C-alpha cells in the first residue's frame, strides 16, 4: 500500500497538494487534507476557476459550487452559492449538520458562522464588463 | 474547478470538488462539480475519483461513479479512468458531436494507493503527492 | 421484445401511465409519453408530492425539482424552482436549448413562455401552518 | 415524487422525474429527483431506472446509475434493482444506521422491455402498462 497519498486536478493541484500534505504527513485525516488543499485555491484571487476571483455568471454574480465526501458515505453539497469564499467548507457543514442551493445555501452558511464577502475581484469585474461588450 | 482525492495513513479515502463554474454562464447554471455521482465519488471499500472538464458530459455519464464501479470490477485506477473516458467518446459520437469541443479529465485512487488518470484531450495534467514527493504527471488522452 | 411499456412510481403512477399510454399506443416517442405522464401529477393539486399539489419548504415556499433524459443521452434538470407548475417541461426546454437552479431556473422558464402561478394551495398553506406550531 | 420510464415502439427509452421534495425542508434543499446519477438514469443501449425513498440516500449511493450499470453487466432489471438495494443495505450498516429509518427502492426497464423493481422496505408499489394493460405491482423488499 502506498499511503498517505493525494491527487488533484490541473497544474494548480501541485501547490494545493503541498497544503494537503501538511495534514497527511502528520497522520491527519483524508477529509481534513482535501478540505485544506482545495481551500488554498478557493482563497487565491488569481485562480479564476475556483472560489474568490472566479469569473462570474453573465449577470456579474460569482456563484460557486462544491461537494465533499468522507470515508463513510457522508456527503455534503452546495451549488450556486454567493458571497462565501470557501464553499467546500459550507459543504462540509452540510454534510456534518445533503445538498443546498442558491439563497438557501447562503442562509445556511451565515447560520454556521461564515461571512459574506465580495467575491468579484476588480480583474474579474473588468473582464466580465469586456465580455458584455461583444 | 479543482478536484482532490486522498488516502490517509489510516487507509481512509475522502475527496473534495470546488468551482466557480463556466465563465459567464446563465444565472443558476450548475455543472458536475457539486454532484456526487459526477464530479466526485468515494467508496472506502474500493477507491475514489474526481473529474473536471465540460460539466455537461460528466453529468450525462455519471463519470466518477463509473470510474469507481470499474475499480470495483477489478480495473486498475488508470484502466478505470481510461474506460470511462472511452464511454464519453462513444456517446459524443452517438450524439454526432465533435470530440474537439469537449474536455474531461478523471483521476482515481484505490484502497492500496494505486492511482491513475485519463482525459479526452491533451493538456490536462494532475498532481500527485506521496512519501516520494509531489509530482506533476501527464496521463494518456483519447483524441489523437 | 415487450414494447411499448411504461413504468412509474406509486399509485398515482397508475394514473400517469394512462396518459403515457395515449402517446405510446399510437407509436409516439418515449420522451413525449413520459413528459405527458408526469405532467398529470404535476397538474393535480390533490397530489401533494408533485408540482401544484406540493407541500412547501419550512418557509412556506413550494420549490420543485425535475429532470428528464432522452434516448440519446440528452438531459435537462431544474432544481429549487418556484412558481412553475410543470418543472418537467422546463427541464425538457433546458435539455433542448444541462442544470439550472433557483431564481435562474425560473428566469429561464419565463424566457421560454412558461407562466408564473401560485403553487401553494389552501390545503398546503393550512398544513404548513400546523407544522410551524409543532 | 413521481418517476416514469418508458420504452416506445421504436425500441427507444426515455425517463422523467419530478417532485416537490421533502415536506418542510430547509429552504434550498435539493433531493435526488433532479440529479442524473440518482433519481433517474437512461442509457438507450442498456435500459432505464428511476428511484423512490429518502432522497439523501439515493444521492449518496448514486442509485439509478448503479442499477443501469448492473444491467449493463448483464443483470436482469429485477436482479439489478435487488442487487442495488442489497449493496445499499450494506452501506446503511457500515454507517451505523437503522434500515427501518431508510427507504430506497428502484424500478427498471431494459431494451427488451423486461422490467423489475425492488426496495428496502415493504409498502412501495409501482405501475406498469404494456399490451397486457395497466397494473399496480408490489416488488420484493430486503427488510424482512
Q: Which residues, at least 6 apart from A33, have a Cβ–Cβ distance to it below 8 Å? A: A4, A6, A20, A21, A23, A24, B6, B8, B14
CA C95 to chain centre: 14
DSSP string of B27-93, one letter each residue: TTEE-STT-TTTTEEEETTTEEEEEEE-HHHHHHHTHHHHHHHHHHTT--HHHHHHHHHHHHHHHHH
CA C3 to chain centre: 25
**In this complex, which of D2, D7, D33 lies closest to C5 when CB atoms are compared?**
D7
Q: Are strands D104-110 and D47-53 parallel, antiparallel or unpaired?
A: antiparallel
Q: How many CB atoms neighbour CB C65 within 10 A?
A: 30
Identify the burial level of C129 via C-beta atoms within 10 angstroms of its C-beta, where 0-12 means exposed, 13-18 middle and 19 or more buried.
exposed
Q: Which residues, at least 6 apart from A67, have a Cβ–Cβ distance to it below 8 Å? A: A75, A76, A77, A78, A91, A99, B16, B17, B33, B34, B35, B36, B39, B40
Output the nine-digit C-alpha cell for C54.
406540493
Question: Nearest to residue C134, comparing CAs of A111, D23, D27, D55?
Answer: D23
D57: nearest CA partner in chain A: A98
Is D28 within 8 Å of A73 when comparing Cβ atoms?
no
Header resolution in angstroms: 1.5
Helix pair angle (C87-96, C102-111), 10° resolution:
80
**Using an 8 Å Cβ cutoff, are D21 and C63 in contact?**
yes
CA atoms of B54 and B104, how far apart (whole Å): 6
Cis peptide before A4 (omega within 30 of 0): yes
Is D95 within 8 Å of A73 when comparing Cβ atoms?
yes
Identify the burial level of C132 via C-beta atoms within 10 angstroms of its C-beta, where 0-12 means exposed, 13-18 middle and 19 or more buried.
exposed
User: How wide is the angle at C-alpha C79 spanned by C-alphas A63 and C63, nearest 5°?
Assistant: 110
Identify the burial level of B93 via C-beta atoms within 10 angstroms of its C-beta, where 0-12 means exposed, 13-18 middle and 19 or more buried.
exposed
**Using an 8 Å Cβ cutoff, are D18 and C64 in contact?**
yes
B32 contacts chain D (CB < 8 A): no
Q: How many CB atoms neighbour CB C78 within 10 A?
A: 32
Residue A13 Cα distances to A79, B11, B103, B118, angstroms: 22, 22, 18, 16
- DSSP summary character for residue C10: S
C chain contacts of residue D131, beta-carbon cutoff 8 Å: 2
Question: Nearest to residue A100, comparing CAs of C65, C124, B62?
Answer: C65
- Strand, helix or coil at B131? coil
CATH among 1.10.10.10, 3.40.30.10, 3.40.50.620, 3.60.20.30 for B1-144: 3.60.20.30
Q: What are phi and psi of D122, to 5 degrees?
A: -60, 155
Distance from the Cα of A51 to chain B's closest Cα (Å) equals 6
- Strand, helix or coil at A132? helix
Biggest CA-to-CA distance, chain A: 55
Distance from the Cα of D68 to chain C's closest Cα (Å) equals 13
Domain coordinates in residue numbering, chain D: 1-144
Question: Nearest to residue C89, comparing CAs of C78, C80, C98?
Answer: C78
B31: nearest CA partner in chain C: C99
Output the nine-digit C-alpha cell for D116.
423489475
CA atoms of D93 and C89, how far apart (whole Å): 38
The structure's method of determination equals X-ray
Residues of D serving a catalytic function are 1
Which residue is listed with cell 462540509? A92
A117 contacts chain C (CB < 8 A): no
Q: How many CB atoms neighbour CB D98 within 10 A?
A: 10
Which residue is listed with cell 446503511? D92
CA atoms of B71 and B48, how far apart (whole Å): 9
**3-state SS track over C58-95:** CCCCCCEEEEEECCCCCEEEEEEECCCCCHHHHHHHHH
Question: Nearest to residue C34, comparing CAs of C26, C24, C44?
Answer: C24
> From the DSSP assignment, how many helices (H) and strands (E) are in chain A?
5, 4
Residue A127 Cα distances to A44, A55, A64, A104, B86, angstroms: 17, 8, 18, 29, 36
Helix pair angle (C11-24, C30-43), 10° resolution:
140
CA atoms of D101 and B115, how far apart (whole Å): 37
**Using an 8 Å Cβ cutoff, are D55 and C89 in contact?**
no
Question: Nearest to residue A71, comparing CAs of B78, B116, B8?
Answer: B8
Question: Nearest to residue A72, comparing CAs of A31, A26, A27?
Answer: A31
Which residue is listed with cell 516520494? B132
A79 contacts chain C (CB < 8 A): yes
**In this complex, which of B33, B117, B134 lies closest to A67 when CB atoms are compared?**
B33
CA B55 to chain centre: 11
Is D115 within 8 Å of C12 when comparing Cβ atoms?
no
Distance from the Cα of A41 to chain C's closest Cα (Å) equals 25
Residue A88 Cα distances to A105, B68, D99, angstroms: 12, 22, 30
CA atoms of C5 and A12, how far apart (whole Å): 50
Is A29 within 8 Å of B1 when comparing Cβ atoms?
no
CA atoms of B70 and D66, how far apart (whole Å): 11
A122-128 own/partner pairs: CB under 8 Å, 24+ apart: A123/A45, A123/A48, A123/A53, A124/A48, A124/A53, A124/A54, A124/A55, A124/A56, A124/A62, A125/A56, A125/A60, A127/A55, A128/A55, A128/A56, A128/A60, A128/B24
C125: nearest CA partner in chain D: D24
- Strand, helix or coil at A97? coil
Q: Chain C to chain D, count of Cβ pairs less than 8 Å apart?
A: 254
Q: What are phi and psi of C126, to 5 degrees?
A: -55, -50
Is B55 within 8 Å of C98 when comparing Cβ atoms?
yes
Radius of gyration for the alpha carbons in chain A, expressed in angstroms and rounded? 16
What residues in chain C have their Cβ under 8 A from chain B's Cβ atoms? Answer: 72-75, 79, 98-105, 107-108
A57: nearest CA partner in chain C: C104
Cα atoms in the Cβ-side hemisphere of radius 13 Å centred on D108: 32
Radius of gyration for the alpha carbons in chain B, expressed in angstroms and rounded? 14
CA atoms of B113 and B109, how far apart (whole Å): 6
Output the nine-digit C-alpha cell for B89.
467518446
Q: How many CB atoms neighbour CB D80 within 10 A?
A: 27
Output the nine-digit C-alpha cell for C47.
397530489
**3-state SS track over chain D:** CEEEEEECCCCCEEEEEEECCCCCCCCCECCCCCCCCCCEEEECCCEEEEEEECHHHHHHHCHHHHHHHHHHHCCCHHHHHHHHHHHHHHHHHHCCCCHHHCCEEEEEEECCCCEEEEECCCCCCEEEEECCEEEEECCEECCC
**In this complex, which of B26, B60, B91 lies closest to C104 when CB atoms are compared?**
B26
Amino acid at each position: 500500500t502506498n499511503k498517505p497519498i493525494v491527487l488533484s486536478t490541473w497544474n494548480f493541484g501541485l501547490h494545493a497538494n503541498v497544503e494537503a500534505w501538511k495534514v497527511l504527513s502528520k497522520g491527519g485525516k483524508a477529509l481534513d487534507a482535501v478540505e485544506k488543499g482545495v481551500r488554498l485555491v478557493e482563497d487565491d484571487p488569481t485562480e479564476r476557476s475556483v472560489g474568490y476571483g472566479g469569473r462570474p455568471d453573465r449577470d456579474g454574480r460569482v456563484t460557486l459550487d462544491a461537494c465533499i465526501m468522507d470515508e463513510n458515505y457522508n456527503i455534503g453539497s452546495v451549488a450556486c452559492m454567493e458571497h462565501i469564499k470557501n464553499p467546500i467548507s459550507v459543504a462540509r457543514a452540510v454534510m456534518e449538520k445533503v445538498m443546498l442551493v442558491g439563497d438557501g445555501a447562503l442562509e445556511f452558511a451565515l447560520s454556521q458562522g461564515f461571512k459574506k464577502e465580495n467575491l468579484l475581484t476588480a480583474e474579474s469585474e473588468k473582464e466580465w464588463k469586456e465580455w458584455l461588450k461583444t | 474547478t479543482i478536484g482532490m482525492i486522498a488516502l490517509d495513513a489510516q487507509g481512509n479515502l475522502s475527496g473534495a470538488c470546488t468551482t466557480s463554474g463556466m465563465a459567464y454562464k446563465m444565472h443558476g447554471r450548475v455543472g458536475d462539480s457539486p454532484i456526487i455521482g459526477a464530479g466526485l465519488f468515494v467508496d472506502n471499500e474500493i477507491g475514489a475519483a474526481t473529474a473536471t472538464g465540460h460539466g455537461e458530459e460528466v453529468i450525462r455519464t455519471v463519470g466518477t461513479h463509473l470510474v469507481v464501479e470499474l475499480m470495483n470490477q477489478g480495473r486498475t485506477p488508470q484502466q478505470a479512468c481510461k474506460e470511462a473516458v472511452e464511454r464519453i467518446v462513444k456517446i459524443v459520437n452517438r450524439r454526432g458531436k465533435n470530440l474537439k469541443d469537449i474536455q474531461v479529465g478523471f483521476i482515481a485512487l484505490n484502497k492500496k494507493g494505486e492511482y491513475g488518470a485519463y482525459c479526452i484531450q491533451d493538456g490536462f495534467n494532475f498532481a500527485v503527492h506521496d512519501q516520494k514527493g509531489n509530482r506533476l504527471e501527464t496521463p494518456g488522452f483519447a483524441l489523437k
